[PDB]
Specification:
This is part of a larger assembly, with chains A, B, C, D and E. By secondary structure, chain C is α/β, with parallel strands linked by helices. Chain C contains 20 helices and 21 strands. A 3-stranded antiparallel sheet of chain D has the order 2-1-3. Chain D is mainly alpha-helical. In chain D, α6 runs parallel beside α8. By secondary structure, chain E is α+β, with helices and mostly antiparallel strands. In chain E, the strands form 6 sheets. Chain E has a 7-stranded mixed sheet, with no helix packed on it. Chain E has a 6-stranded mixed sheet with strand order 2-14-15-19-21-20, with helices on one face. The chains are: A mainly alpha, B alpha+beta, C alpha/beta, D mainly alpha, E alpha+beta. Chains in contact: A-B, A-C, B-E, C-D, C-E. The interface between C and E is small, with 9 and 11 residues. β1 of chain A pairs antiparallel with β8 of chain B. The structure holds phosphoaminophosphonic acid-adenylate ester and magnesium ion. Phosphoaminophosphonic acid-adenylate ester (ANP) binds next to α10 and α16 of chain C. Chain B: It is found in: Nucleus. Chain B: This is DNA polymerase alpha catalytic subunit A.
């Protein structure tokens, strides 16, 4: 049969937003303006302020998504090929690190709001994008034999969840889905919020988690790594103090949370 | 920050008529007793001379370069109120006052901030959106003797701005040439991320 | 099941990317919301199928090959877009549960799926197709139940339920019995809330292949189409039409136990998604047309330019051309406050020798008027020309069909006396009335009549009276505004000019052809049609004192002075002057009739009536 | 593109729409009136061997070329939806020659990408009908009425090649 | 009457109500369109709305006003005087390839023009001077000279001491000449001079200088100097002797390189032309003289290299400063900016230069075509000037570049005018000033050693100056630590050509005078390097190298433009 046969910064941000979301993993390079610094930080700050306001009003995920999604096209676009939007998103996150690393209360508020925004944007993805994003983060499934041995317990655990979360009211549909579903085994301490609600099966100190759940692990890893990075950011704030032109902006940004 | 507050200390742009030599302050597309902005461009009210784009842009560029040259004259002033010495001499310590016994700090009399704000003030005068929104620094106060009696309507200002868009963009491009070379602008993330270089 | 959600998401991305559809949603919504506070536009949008191809090929081919699985989620996403956009608060009881989503329609580039009724084949079932043909039958409109609402008497709770039938949905579901529930699950007696329930309109039609395509005198073939909601009654029999929709099958096909031994086939239909007409008359002006029309109207002699641009291939007869132009413009129809009616439309008759271009000139009007019917005088009966009875039903004739148009009658002299007298009402009262066994009705017929005839002796005889040469009663000739006599007078230079003219005409070649291959300034006819349409719709000249001063003087002199005039002069002559003056003012795009228009109208009537200027 | 090639000689004679940029005396014979001038912004339909030069020689050249109907947007959409069903013979007898000439003249990038796909997609069915030898006429004859003059030569030289091989083998 | 009947003869008689008349009249006055034009646009407006009742009401006219503004904005969116060495050296014949039409690649007689500096270092952002950075540069200058002096005179580091501290023993001191008073009033005498020390040498303190024991001196502000003296009383440093600063070394080449350069010119002499702006008078923008000059360059003079100093468009030009720029009838489209003015006036003329003439352009800090408005200054952007890459090279200011073996040092700042000397003694005063200034430039190893830079004021308002970016003054030093063979510093003073310490120093003068009269340019003829004629000096070492001795084999003619 027949057969034939700075740019680096732009490539970096194309790579960082191929997954459409990022853990915000890497040091930015090159330059932007100081006006851009202020405006981009304020835009992300407005979205996070509304997220915290809605959470203080005890609104649900669906309501917050209805409130916040129209704001992306104006303040902080998502699911976009534009280099400007990608740089705006990335840089605004990094700026608010330096604003909100300053104290435990600021770190907690910023981690909460940013993790909830992460959850919102992850919900906006297609399942293929979610899979690719999770795989890009280098993030144990059980064997078919172990699934067969624990099938009664796992099905008893997830059958209600399949009906209420995936709308599978028919038991036949639940059985077919369960036959196609994969399960993850990890220590129970890693998914303790699901343990307290008895949403996972426990055996010998390990929790058995279906593949259609477990986004709380992803968002908790995002929150934990962001908290550690903020702690690091706090430790080298004395180097930020070398440019005076940034400190009034950061003081202004933090004043809306104090 | 409003343009009024930002540009409080900036020098007003003065234009000299090419025909009658009368000098007047230029405040963008606004009512003035000294000039009128028509559909054809800027016109002197004294002799009705219409300014060519080159005549306007050259005067702007001359003013910009005059401010740059003033900045590089390098006048320094001591911040101690008792000494207040003004000199162009720079000590090998830079900030040390050259007057014997003075502990004040020497500073540029015309700072890079003041120059940058001056250039932005010039840029604002030719911003079409700011002209339409009437967000420019006023060149007349209501109590001024030269306050214009007849005010342009908002609709007239929007129309005149649209009609003179090419002229305004040309003037703005002249200012932006120098603003792009101003060191006071950009922020380098590569150097900034020295902790990842720990 | 999960795939439905992803298809909704993907179409949402399309709607966000191609923004011209958001403007369409929003403009319909704000228009409807405005007049609601005082017609209403339908909740329907037409998408270019090319945009969808360039956006996502996998969704494009899905719509075009598996419509039952792709059209419903796409339509759902459109409704979410329109619903999330802002809308008027505090809706009424009927608005709260209307069961009324938005709906899609398509245009452009169907490729292989553009078909005709002869070639639609079993391979194309469940595909999205486009067909072309002629409408032959239409059913009556009927309402159809889809949802009902009930109020429970004791508990105070409002209940509801939904219904389905095989033609209501692209996907297939268990049929519903059309019963109303009388009693609650908990035993409470129920009541039915009409006005909160929802019903929709339904209509079936039939489309047949065009006769131009029929092979070998063989039987023609046809398809039935289903229409609903907004698409109802937009067609009538005889329309040429292009229909877009899904081609589908129905029923049990005799496999539910039958005597046929299952030799009979399944039933099939097209579910009407979009309908477009075919031009086989009207045009719509662009901005540039308005500018050109208004600029041209300020020339000194627009009437000469326009009149000479009618039938340039016919030499001579300037005045008849001018009369035809004024006929195409027409007067102004008056309805007085007491219900009394005054006529507006101009009728013209021309009689003359053989071969003098009468039929050829009459043929031109038929190809420049927006609505025109043509007939020969002996090929038509009085009832066929006005109206006839059938089964009781009353059926229209030619003068009733061309209502606001022109009717052309050739060989008028051959029409029998019994046929002519049926026309006396139609040319003045502009109505037709029948009083026959089991029927009494009045019909409207507002057209202008133009006709041609031969004189009694075969050529016009100047040595005998006009009444002897023209065998028609005085009451009929009175109803024609302008009566023209034309003859073939032999003269050297006239013969030479005409013969050279027709020879220059026969040496024309059309633009795209080599020689021998088989097939002042003059405005083009496609521009003249726009000029006439614009002038007839947008300007209505009012009369003035200066014009009246001319009209009264001319009428009284013309009636009272003794002359060998060729037509009876009556109260209808005065109206002919008013009509002609108004029509000339309309050519000029004037808002008022002036002294000039009255003068020109008088100088045309004097020529036709008294034979000389 | 040889000098003595009949098809090239014949394809250069197709007319394209044009507009003038100067008034010129006596050249009214182009407008079929030898006794008059040409005037600026007049529009005429001229053969390609002439318009190809008057569009280049100066400054402003004498004539400007208007976008012809055979490269209209409708044709491009028809090409991109289903290339195999398309009746190119009715669109223009010499389509793939004029396409290359127009591409050279204006150095179009996207038109080349459209035309390359069109040719590659039609070659498939052309080979299918070339390979199919009798041991039928209607099924083949319906598609072979939609070929360009350019495509007919490829079809003929393919069919003869397969047939000669088949004849030699079974002999 | 007129507006009313005009409306009523286009709009219907229904318009007779005076409010309707007033509204339509307002529209025609607002937008300048006639009544019939307004009627036409009203008809456009009546289309496309399904509104057969487009009645002539006030609300409909308001919507028509909105429609009119939408149409307006959419339409907008749619739309020989003196000579050096004349008796010994003949004028070169020039480049023989000039005037030959031949497209053929210029194979053999290729004068190589190569920059001898890092162009990237000149592309710094201007208008941001940190005072600490400026002071660091000024301190480093004193320290660098201290090291040079120590090595040259073989002095111990302990021989240097703080001149501000009282000492009975003689010490060596290096510092910068500064005024005794920080508020000094423009006239410096020998008694008003102080020495500023480095941070390490004297903690940056200033000490008054007692120059009573020095008979001959020539000092200027910003000069780095070395003294032997003592501070006996603590108030003034008594200078006993001035230590002359060592001159930098001269450039050298190998025998192989010199033979290659000799073969490149086929034994002929190099011909270089140097011009300095302005290129038009103070009362017009005529470039007739420049055109005539370029025609002569291409047909008669035929140089190998043309060096053109700015300003090309002087921002301080009187017509620019007053805004009285003329109309240019020769141009179909008038220029809109000074950059466009260059492209319409200078670029067509410069493009006529023969491609066989290598053209070097050096900007001025007064040049409107340069956005880098500070000394040191970045090069002009050749592409923005639309000049051909083949034979045009844009260089920085100052610029050091090599033509064959010859090292050229160019600075487009008026050091000769700006450097004001404080002199004492009869012998020093009898010497020619420009020689002494040239020696100061060479000894200081910088093209513009004056600090603070000069300023020009008018009745006071600042006009212009040297416009020094102090933080980058290191780029104004001699590149490689050696003097140039030929130093070109244009000055407003009278043109001259001189040999100062084996360096040919040239002021070409202005190309055109302010009145429009002809100015001057410099023609440089340099004989080819010959190892056999004895004009080169062999320097013995591991690899034998030769001093160029360009001053022995160069002729400079100052010629009327
Ligand atoms: N300028 C002209 N004057 C008269 N006849 C003309 C003229 N130009 C063409 N004809 C031809 O005259 C012939 C007869 O025209 P036609 O309109 O049928 O005459 P007519 O008045 O209807 N005669 P008839 O049918 O006997 O009543 C046609 O073949 C026309 O083409
Ligand atoms: Mg006839």
């Amino acid at each position: 049969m027949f057969r034939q046969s700075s740019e680096e910064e732009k490539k970096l941000y194309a790579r960082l937003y191929e997954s459409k979301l990022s853990f915000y993993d890497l040091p930015p390079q090159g330059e932007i303006t100081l006006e851009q610094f202020e405006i981009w930080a304020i835009d992300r700050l407005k979205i996070l302020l509304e997220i915290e306001s809605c959470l203080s009003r005890n609104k649900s995920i669906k309501e917050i998504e209805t409130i916040i999604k129209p704001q992306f096209q104006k303040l902080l676009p998502f699911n976009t090929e534009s280099l400007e939007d990608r740089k705006k998103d990335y840089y605004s996150h990094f700026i608010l690190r330096l604003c909100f690393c300053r104290s435990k209360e600021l770190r907690e508020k910023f981690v909460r709001a940013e993790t909830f925004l992460f959850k919102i944007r992850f919900n906006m993805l297609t399942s293929t994008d979610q899979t690719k994003f999770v795989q890009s983060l280098d993030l144990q499934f059980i064997s078919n034999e172990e699934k067969a041995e624990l099938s009664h317990q796992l099905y008893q655990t997830v059958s209600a969840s399949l009906q209420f979360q995936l709308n599978l009211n028919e038991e036949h549909q639940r059985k077919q889905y369960f036959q196609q579903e994969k399960f993850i085994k990890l220590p129970f301490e890693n998914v303790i919020e699901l343990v307290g609600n008895r949403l996972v099966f426990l055996k010998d100190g390990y929790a058995y988690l279906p593949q259609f759940q477990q986004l709380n692990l992803l968002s908790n890893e995002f929150a934990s790594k962001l908290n550690q990075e903020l702690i690091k950011t706090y430790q080298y704030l004395p180097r930020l103090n070398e440019d005076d032109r940034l400190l009034p902006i950061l003081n202004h940004l933090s004043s809306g949370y104090t | 920050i409003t343009d009024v507050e930002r540009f409080k200390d900036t020098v007003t742009l003065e234009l000299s008529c090419p025909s009658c030599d009368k000098r007047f302050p230029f405040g963008g597309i606004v009512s003035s007793n000294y000039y009128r902005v028509s559909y054809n461009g800027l016109q002197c009210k004294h002799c009705e001379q219409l300014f060519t784009p080159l005549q306007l842009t050259s005067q702007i560029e001359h003013s910009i370069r005059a401010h740059i040259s003033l900045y590089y004259a390098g006048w320094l002033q001591c911040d101690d109120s008792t000494c207040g010495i003004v000199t162009r001499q720079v000590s090998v310590f830079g900030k040390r006052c050259l007057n014997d016994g003075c502990t004040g700090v020497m500073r540029y009399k015309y700072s890079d901030k003041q120059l940058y704000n001056q250039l932005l003030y010039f840029d604002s005068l030719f911003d079409c959106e700011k002209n339409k929104k009437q967000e420019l620094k006023p060149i007349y106060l209501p109590d001024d003797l030269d306050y214009p009696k007849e005010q342009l309507t908002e609709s007239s200002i929007k129309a005149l701005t649209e009609q003179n868009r090419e002229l305004m963009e040309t003037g703005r491009s002249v200012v932006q040439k120098y603003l792009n070379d101003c060191g006071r602008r950009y922020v380098d993330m590569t150097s900034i991320f020295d902790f990842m270089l720990n | 099941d999960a795939v439905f959600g992803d298809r909704v998401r993907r179409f949402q991305e399309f709607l966000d990317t191609f923004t011209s559809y958001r403007d369409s949603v929003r403009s319909i919504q704000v228009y409807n919301s405005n007049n609601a506070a005082n017609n209403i536009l339908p909740h329907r949008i037409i998408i270019s199928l090319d945009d969808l191809r360039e956006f996502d090929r996998s969704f494009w081919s899905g719509i075009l090959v598996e419509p039952a699985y792709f059209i419903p989620p796409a339509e759902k996403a459109l409704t979410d877009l329109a619903d999330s956009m802002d809308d008027v608060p505090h809706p009424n009881a009927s608005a709260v549960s209307s069961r009324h989503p938005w709906k899609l329609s398509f245009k452009g580039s169907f490729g292989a799926h553009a078909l005709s009724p002869r070639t639609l084949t079993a391979q194309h079932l469940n595909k999205l197709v486009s067909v072309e043909g002629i409408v032959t039958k239409t059913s009556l409109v009927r309402p159809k139940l889809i949802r009902s609402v009930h109020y429970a008497a004791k508990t105070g709770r409002f209940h509801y339920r939904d219904y389905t039938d095989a033609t209501t949905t692209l996907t297939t579901r268990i049929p519903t019995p059309a019963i109303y529930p009388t009693e609650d699950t908990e035993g409470n007696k129920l009541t039915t809330e009409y006005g909160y329930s929802t019903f929709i309109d339904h209509q079936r039609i039939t489309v047949q292949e065009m006769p131009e395509m029929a092979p070998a005198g063989q039987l023609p073939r046809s398809i039935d189409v289903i229409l609903d909601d907004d698409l109802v009654d937009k067609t009538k029999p005889g329309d040429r039409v292009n229909v877009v929709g899904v081609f589908k099958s129905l029923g049990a096909g005799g496999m539910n136990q039958s005597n046929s031994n299952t030799l009979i086939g399944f039933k099939t239909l097209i579910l009407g998604n979009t309908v477009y007409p075919l031009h086989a008359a009207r045009q719509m002006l662009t901005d540039f047309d308005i500018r050109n029309i208004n600029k041209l109207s300020k020339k000194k002699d627009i009437f000469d330019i326009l009149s000479q641009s009618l039938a340039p291939s016919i030499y001579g007869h300037d005045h008849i051309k001018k009369a035809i132009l004024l006929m195409l413009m027409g007067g102004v129809e008056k309805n007085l406050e007491n219900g009394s009616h005054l006529r507006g439309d101009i009728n013209i008759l021309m009689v003359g020798d053989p071969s003098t271009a009468k039929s050829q000139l009459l043929r031109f009007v038929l190809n420049t008027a927006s609505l025109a019917i043509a007939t020969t005088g002996r090929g038509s009966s009085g009832v066929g020309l006005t109206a006839a009875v059938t089964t009781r039903r009353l059926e229209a004739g030619a003068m009733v069909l061309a209502d606001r148009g022109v009717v052309c009658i050739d060989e008028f002299d051959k029409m029998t006396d019994v046929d002519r007298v049926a026309i006396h009402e139609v040319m003045e009262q502009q109505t037709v009335t029948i009083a026959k066994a089991g029927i009494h009705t009045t019909l409207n017929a507002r057209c202008s009549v133009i006709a041609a005839a031969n004189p009694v002796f075969g050529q016009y005889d100047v040595n005998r009276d006009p009444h002897q040469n023209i065998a028609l009663p005085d009451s009929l000739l009175s109803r024609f505004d302008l009566l023209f006599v034309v003859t073939d007078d032999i003269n050297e230079i006239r013969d030479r000019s005409i013969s050279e003219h027709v020879l220059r005409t026969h040496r024309y070649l059309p633009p795209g052809y080599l020689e021998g291959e088989p097939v002042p300034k003059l405005v083009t006819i496609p521009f003249l049609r726009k000029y006439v349409q614009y002038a007839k719709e947008r300007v209505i000249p009012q009369l003035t004192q200066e014009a009246i001063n001319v009209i009264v003087k001319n009428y009284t002199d013309l009636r009272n002075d003794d002359n060998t005039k060729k037509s009876p002069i009556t109260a209808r002559t005065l109206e002919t002057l008013i009509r002609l003056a108004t029509a000339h003012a309309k050519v000029r795009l004037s808002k008022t009739v002036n002294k000039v228009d009255a003068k020109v109208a008088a100088n045309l009537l004097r020529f036709a009536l008294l034979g000389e200027d | 593109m040889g000098y003595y090639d009949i098809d090239d000689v014949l394809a250069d004679g197709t007319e394209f729409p044009c507009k003038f940029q100067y008034d010129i005396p006596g050249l009214g014979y182009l407008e079929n009136n030898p006794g008059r001038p040409i005037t600026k912004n007049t529009k005429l339909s001229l053969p390609l061997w002439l318009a190809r030069i008057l569009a280049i020689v100066g400054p402003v050249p004498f004539v400007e070329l208007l976008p012809p109907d055979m490269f209209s947007t409708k044709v491009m959409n028809a090409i991109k939806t289903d290339p195999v069903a398309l009746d190119l013979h009715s669109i223009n007898s010499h389509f793939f020659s004029l396409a290359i000439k127009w591409i050279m003249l204006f150095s179009e990038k996207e038109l080349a990408n459209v035309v390359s796909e069109l040719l590659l997609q039609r070659a498939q069915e052309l080979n299918h009908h070339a390979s199919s030898l009798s041991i039928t006429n209607i099924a083949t004859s319906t598609f072979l009425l939609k070929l360009e003059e350019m495509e007919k030569e490829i079809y003929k030289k393919s069919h003869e090649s397969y047939k000669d091989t088949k004849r030699w083998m079974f002999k | 009457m007129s507006g009313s009947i005009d409306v009523i003869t286009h709009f219907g008689p229904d318009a007779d109500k005076p409010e309707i008349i007033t509204a339509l009249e307002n529209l025609t006055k607002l937008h300048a369109l006639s009544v019939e034009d307004l009627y036409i646009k009203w008809e456009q407006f009546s289309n496309q709305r399904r509104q057969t009742h487009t009645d002539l009401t006030s609300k409909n006219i308001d919507e028509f006003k909105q429609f009119l503004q939408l149409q307006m904005e959419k339409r907008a969116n749619q739309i020989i005087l003196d000579s050096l060495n004349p008796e010994n050296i003949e004028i070169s014949s020039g480049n023989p390839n000039v005037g030959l039409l031949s497209t053929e690649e210029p194979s053999y007689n290729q004068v190589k023009v190569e920059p001898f500096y890092d162009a990237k270092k000149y592309k710094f952002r201007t208008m941001r001077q940190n005072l600490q950075e400026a002071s660091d540069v000024l301190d480093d200058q004193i320290e660098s000279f201290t090291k040079i002096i120590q090595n040259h005179y073989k002095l111990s580091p302990n021989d240097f001491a703080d001149p501000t501290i009282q000492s009975q023993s003689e010490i060596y001191a290096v510092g910068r000449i500064v005024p005794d008073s920080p508020t000094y009033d423009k006239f410096l005498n020998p008694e008003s001079l102080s020495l500023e020390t480095s941070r390490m040498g004297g903690v940056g303190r200033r000490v008054r200088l007692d120059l009573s024991q020095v008979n001959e001196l020539s000092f200027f502000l910003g000069q780095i100097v070395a003294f032997k003296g003592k501070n006996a009383n603590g108030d003034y440093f008594t200078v006993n002797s001035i230590l002359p600063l060592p001159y930098p070394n001269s450039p050298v080449s190998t025998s192989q390189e010199l033979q290659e350069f000799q073969a490149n010119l086929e034994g002929s002499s190099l011909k270089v032309i140097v011009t300095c702006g302005p290129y038009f008078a103070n009362d017009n923008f005529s470039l007739e003289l420049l055109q005539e000059f370029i025609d002569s360059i291409n047909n008669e003079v035929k140089p190998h290299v043309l060096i053109m100093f700015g300003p090309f468009i002087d921002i301080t030009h009187p017509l620019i400063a007053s805004g009285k720029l003329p109309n240019f009838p020769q141009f179909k489209t008038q220029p809109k900016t000074l950059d466009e003015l260059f492209l319409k006036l200078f670029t067509p003329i410069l493009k006529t230069i023969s491609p066989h003439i290598q053209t070097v352009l050096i900007p001025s800090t007064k040049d409107a075509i340069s956005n880098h408005a500070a000394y040191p200054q970045a090069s002009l952007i050749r592409k923005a000037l639309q000049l051909p890459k083949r034979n045009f090279k844009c260089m920085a200011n100052p610029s050091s570049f090599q033509i064959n073996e010859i090292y050229f040092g160019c600075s487009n700042v008026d050091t000769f005018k700006d450097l004001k000397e404080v002199i004492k003694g009869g012998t020093t005063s009898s010497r020619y000033r420009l020689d002494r200034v040239s020696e100061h430039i060479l000894q200081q190893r910088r093209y513009y050693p004056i600090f603070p830079g000069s300023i020009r004021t008018r009745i006071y308002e600042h006009i212009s100056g040297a416009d020094l970016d102090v933080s980058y003054l290191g780029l104004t030093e001699f590149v490689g630590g050696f003097s140039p063979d030929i130093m070109i510093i244009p000055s407003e003073l009278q043109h001259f050509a001189r040999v100062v310490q084996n360096v040919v120093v040239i002021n070409p003068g202005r190309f055109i005078r302010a009145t429009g009269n002809r100015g001057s340019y410099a023609q440089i003829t340099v004989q080819c390097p010959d190892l056999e004629d004895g004009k080169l000096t062999l320097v013995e070492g591991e690899e034998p190298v030769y001093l160029h001795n360009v001053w022995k084999r160069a002729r400079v003619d100052l010629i009327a433009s």
